[PDB]
Enzyme design. Structure first.
Site, PDB file in Angstrom:
ATOM      1  N   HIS A  83     -29.214  42.852 109.827  1.00  0.00           N
ATOM      2  CA  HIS A  83     -28.840  41.882 108.797  1.00  0.00           C
ATOM      3  C   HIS A  83     -27.319  41.871 108.727  1.00  0.00           C
ATOM      4  O   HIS A  83     -26.644  42.503 109.540  1.00  0.00           O
ATOM      5  CB  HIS A  83     -29.520  42.140 107.440  1.00  0.00           C
ATOM      6  CG  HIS A  83     -29.111  43.400 106.734  1.00  0.00           C
ATOM      7  ND1 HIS A  83     -29.683  44.625 106.996  1.00  0.00           N
ATOM      8  CD2 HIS A  83     -28.254  43.600 105.704  1.00  0.00           C
ATOM      9  CE1 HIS A  83     -29.150  45.539 106.202  1.00  0.00           C
ATOM     10  NE2 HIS A  83     -28.283  44.941 105.406  1.00  0.00           N
ATOM     11  N   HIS A  85     -24.900  42.764 106.557  1.00  0.00           N
ATOM     12  CA  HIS A  85     -24.022  43.695 105.854  1.00  0.00           C
ATOM     13  C   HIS A  85     -23.227  44.565 106.837  1.00  0.00           C
ATOM     14  O   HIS A  85     -23.559  44.691 108.022  1.00  0.00           O
ATOM     15  CB  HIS A  85     -24.823  44.596 104.910  1.00  0.00           C
ATOM     16  CG  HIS A  85     -25.357  43.900 103.696  1.00  0.00           C
ATOM     17  ND1 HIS A  85     -26.508  44.319 103.055  1.00  0.00           N
ATOM     18  CD2 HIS A  85     -24.897  42.835 103.000  1.00  0.00           C
ATOM     19  CE1 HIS A  85     -26.730  43.529 102.012  1.00  0.00           C
ATOM     20  NE2 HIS A  85     -25.769  42.624 101.958  1.00  0.00           N
ATOM     21  N   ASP A  87     -22.937  47.735 107.219  1.00  0.00           N
ATOM     22  CA  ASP A  87     -23.573  48.867 107.891  1.00  0.00           C
ATOM     23  C   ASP A  87     -24.434  48.424 109.070  1.00  0.00           C
ATOM     24  O   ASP A  87     -25.043  49.271 109.739  1.00  0.00           O
ATOM     25  CB  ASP A  87     -24.381  49.738 106.907  1.00  0.00           C
ATOM     26  CG  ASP A  87     -25.358  48.954 106.035  1.00  0.00           C
ATOM     27  OD1 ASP A  87     -25.202  47.730 105.849  1.00  0.00           O
ATOM     28  OD2 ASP A  87     -26.279  49.612 105.500  1.00  0.00           O
ATOM     29  N   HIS A 148     -34.510  43.486 101.195  1.00  0.00           N
ATOM     30  CA  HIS A 148     -33.158  43.979 100.948  1.00  0.00           C
ATOM     31  C   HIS A 148     -32.133  42.860 101.062  1.00  0.00           C
ATOM     32  O   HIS A 148     -31.158  42.816 100.302  1.00  0.00           O
ATOM     33  CB  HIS A 148     -32.828  45.098 101.940  1.00  0.00           C
ATOM     34  CG  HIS A 148     -31.381  45.482 101.960  1.00  0.00           C
ATOM     35  ND1 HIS A 148     -30.844  46.407 101.091  1.00  0.00           N
ATOM     36  CD2 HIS A 148     -30.362  45.060 102.742  1.00  0.00           C
ATOM     37  CE1 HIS A 148     -29.554  46.547 101.349  1.00  0.00           C
ATOM     38  NE2 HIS A 148     -29.234  45.730 102.337  1.00  0.00           N
ATOM     39  N   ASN A 179     -27.652  49.242  94.153  1.00  0.00           N
ATOM     40  CA  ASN A 179     -27.063  47.934  94.400  1.00  0.00           C
ATOM     41  C   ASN A 179     -28.057  47.063  95.165  1.00  0.00           C
ATOM     42  O   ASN A 179     -28.479  47.418  96.270  1.00  0.00           O
ATOM     43  CB  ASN A 179     -25.760  48.104  95.182  1.00  0.00           C
ATOM     44  CG  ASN A 179     -24.898  46.862  95.164  1.00  0.00           C
ATOM     45  OD1 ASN A 179     -25.400  45.736  95.191  1.00  0.00           O
ATOM     46  ND2 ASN A 179     -23.582  47.060  95.126  1.00  0.00           N
TER      47      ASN A 179
HETATM   48  O1  LIG Z   1     -28.944  50.313 100.068  1.00  0.00           O
HETATM   49  C1  LIG Z   1     -28.344  50.089 101.162  1.00  0.00           C
HETATM   50  O2  LIG Z   1     -28.945  49.559 102.135  1.00  0.00           O
HETATM   51  C2  LIG Z   1     -26.877  50.442 101.343  1.00  0.00           C
HETATM   52  N1  LIG Z   1     -26.162  50.037 102.383  1.00  0.00           N
HETATM   53  C3  LIG Z   1     -24.934  50.504 102.255  1.00  0.00           C
HETATM   54  C4  LIG Z   1     -24.908  51.228 101.069  1.00  0.00           C
HETATM   55  N2  LIG Z   1     -26.114  51.166 100.532  1.00  0.00           N
HETATM   56  C5  LIG Z   1     -26.510  51.810  99.283  1.00  0.00           C
HETATM   57  C6  LIG Z   1     -27.222  53.140  99.577  1.00  0.00           C
HETATM   58  C7  LIG Z   1     -27.946  53.789  98.583  1.00  0.00           C
HETATM   59  C8  LIG Z   1     -28.593  54.994  98.857  1.00  0.00           C
HETATM   60  C9  LIG Z   1     -28.536  55.566 100.122  1.00  0.00           C
HETATM   61  C10 LIG Z   1     -29.249  56.894 100.415  1.00  0.00           C
HETATM   62  F1  LIG Z   1     -29.035  57.771  99.393  1.00  0.00           F
HETATM   63  F2  LIG Z   1     -30.591  56.682 100.562  1.00  0.00           F
HETATM   64  F3  LIG Z   1     -28.791  57.464 101.562  1.00  0.00           F
HETATM   65  C11 LIG Z   1     -27.806  54.918 101.111  1.00  0.00           C
HETATM   66  C12 LIG Z   1     -27.161  53.717 100.842  1.00  0.00           C
HETATM   67 ZN   LIG Z   2     -27.671  45.780 103.622  1.00  0.00          ZN
HETATM   68 ZN   LIG Z   3     -27.675  49.474 103.923  1.00  0.00          ZN
END
Ligand SMILES: O=C(O)c1nccn1Cc1ccc(C(F)(F)F)cc1
Ligand SMILES: [Zn+2]
Ligand SMILES: [Zn+2]
Length: 231
Positions: A83, A85, A87, A148, A179
């Site tokens: 997607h 974003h 990451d 998501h 978030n």
């Molecule tokens: O929710 C997402 O996809 C996200 N992408 C980038 C940042 N986030 C928030 C996020 C929340 C919790 C975790 C966990 F603790 F599970 F590692 C990891 C990421």
């Molecule tokens: Zn994302």
């Molecule tokens: Zn993510």
């Protein structure tokens, strides 16, 4: 043991062997004041490697390519971002500079452009409607519907029954959605149902962030997402 967030300094990447010719990659990055882990996938594609998602940023993605060369030694020739974003596409410019052909759905490429994120070069055809699946080398790409994000894809490796859920699937220890700015909370449970229906044989389930599990992660994610919608 599967590497956890405290074990990976930001800028380093770990590889984890899941099955013959199937690895996850694990990186860490700051977001909203904390550091989080993030997963992607690497799948042997004959004499080449197929990469699923960047390592969340240019520096991390460069470290990913170096670790792949050191530990596996086959060329990464194609990458799919699941997607729009950072990451998932953050690091596409590094991949492209390294010689990797980068891919995403037309929706993902468009959303990345709108957001000012890096844009994969090539469009994946055949993924425009919920329930669509296409083959891409050694994996199947599946669009389960909005969750998501509206564009999120999941990836299945038939040879090892590995389901990469991307950020649509939460790790077991995660009990809040946090978030969800770009999420479709109303559709997310339905999209997870489509994943369950399409991949009932999955033996290894990899969330976008955190520890792998089994198909229990799907029911778990629905629980968290619904609990967030109730209040
Ligand atoms: O929710 C997402 O996809 C996200 N992408 C980038 C940042 N986030 C928030 C996020 C929340 C919790 C975790 C966990 F603790 F599970 F590692 C990891 C990421
Ligand atoms: Zn994302
Ligand atoms: Zn993510």
């Amino acid at each position: 043991e599967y590497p956890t967030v405290s074990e990976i300094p930001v800028g380093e990447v770990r590889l984890y062997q899941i099955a013959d010719g199937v690895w996850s990659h694990i990186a860490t990055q700051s977001f909203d004041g904390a550091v989080y882990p993030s997963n992607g996938l690497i799948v042997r594609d004959g004499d080449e490697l197929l990469l699923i998602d960047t390592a969340w940023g240019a520096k991390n993605t460069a470290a990913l390519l170096a670790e792949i060369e050191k530990q596996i030694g086959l060329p990464v020739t194609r990458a799919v971002s699941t997607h729009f974003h950072d990451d998932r596409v953050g690091g596409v410019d590094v991949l492209r500079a390294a010689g990797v052909a980068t891919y995403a759905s037309p929706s993902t490429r468009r959303l990345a452009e709108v957001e000012g994120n890096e844009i994969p070069t090539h469009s994946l055809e055949g993924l425009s409607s919920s329930g669509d699946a296409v083959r891409f080398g050694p994996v199947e790409l599946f669009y389960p519907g909005a969750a998501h994000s509206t564009d999120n894809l999941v990836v299945y490796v038939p040879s090892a029954s590995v389901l990469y859920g991307g950020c649509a699937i939460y790790e077991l220890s995660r009990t809040s959605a946090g978030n969800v700015a770009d999420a479709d909370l109303a559709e997310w449970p339905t999209s997870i149902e489509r994943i369950q229906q399409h991949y009932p044989e999955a033996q290894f389930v990899i969330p976008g962030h955190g520890l792998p599990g089994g198909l229990d992660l799907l029911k778990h994610t629905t629980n968290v997402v619904k609990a967030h919608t109730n209040r």
